[PDB]
Amino acid sequence: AMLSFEKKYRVRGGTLIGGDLFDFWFGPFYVGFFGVTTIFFVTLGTLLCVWGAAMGPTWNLWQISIAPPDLKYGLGLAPLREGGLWQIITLCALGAFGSWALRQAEISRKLGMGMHIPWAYGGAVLAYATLVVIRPMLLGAWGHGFPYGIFSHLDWVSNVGYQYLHFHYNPAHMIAVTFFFTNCLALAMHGSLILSVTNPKKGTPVGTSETENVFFRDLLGYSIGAIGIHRLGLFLAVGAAVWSAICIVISGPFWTKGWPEWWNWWLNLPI
Amino acid sequence: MTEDEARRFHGYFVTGTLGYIIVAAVAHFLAWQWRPWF
């Protein structure tokens, strides 16, 4: 099945690895070399997640938890019973996340597009890599990563946040939250703006680009561009993930005490 | 839209509003018999 305009776009070329062997479509999906690599890592990682569930006490979806090894194993590959299975799944996830990004770059190259989508996705991958690779390496043990469980990884976030007695006082966390909140507000504004022009008051014609700019100047005194809003949305969403990666990588590797005590520098200014 | 349309609608709006208030008054009378609030 193809869209009514899809046939003329399904051409060869644009791949980073391979030729006509991996230049086909399986149903709607495009399969490249990195499509094949994605399926390998997804299948291996998911099957090992199912095995970790079978080793545990329950099949309940919310209660399944595959935990990282103890801190005493210290950057080694622990026994698979004792957390080594978590490390293997982590490698499969890294390979699948990397393959997904490279597969996206191949698709945009075939369509004559920019490379923005792979790099925007790389912000999320960087945050994940900080959580399970960079910060655990700086702290010296793979056991500093979070467990793989729907509600188990919420317990990790709670306990890690309270390792600094008040995680709200983290300066980088405060900035990252502002990025997340502003992004949600801007997305609601952008979604409303396009829909209100395209679906206007009943019986009236569809509005124009002037209508958007006039409306937001009337409301706020300033109207970002049609390209400005898409630049801002990319900046807010990706910057939220980048500031999240900073906020967690400075807790422990750089700051070990409580986060409220960090604000001594502001209170001890000479003035 | 016109004067005659306004008069016809007004007649039904007035009867509908007043009849609704009388039915609510009877409901308050029944509620008073059950558990008065003053």
Binding site: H166, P260, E261 | -
Partner: protein, 50 residues
């Protein structure tokens, strides 16, 4: 408590934040701020003879 007695102003905190003692005062040692932390004692003009 079954009853409440009003404390002296010098024993009353100006700041009503619950966590102010552990988040700010435990790290603040400025003497001016420590002085501002509480209300000051008061009297009457008749008590002073004015």
């Amino acid at each position: 408590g079954s009853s409440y007695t009003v404390p002296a102003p010098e024993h009353t905190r100006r700041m009503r934040g619950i966590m102010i003692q552990s988040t700010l005062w435990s790290i603040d040692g400025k003497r001016s701020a420590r002085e501002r932390r509480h209300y000051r004692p008061q009297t009457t003009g008749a008590a002073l003879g004015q």
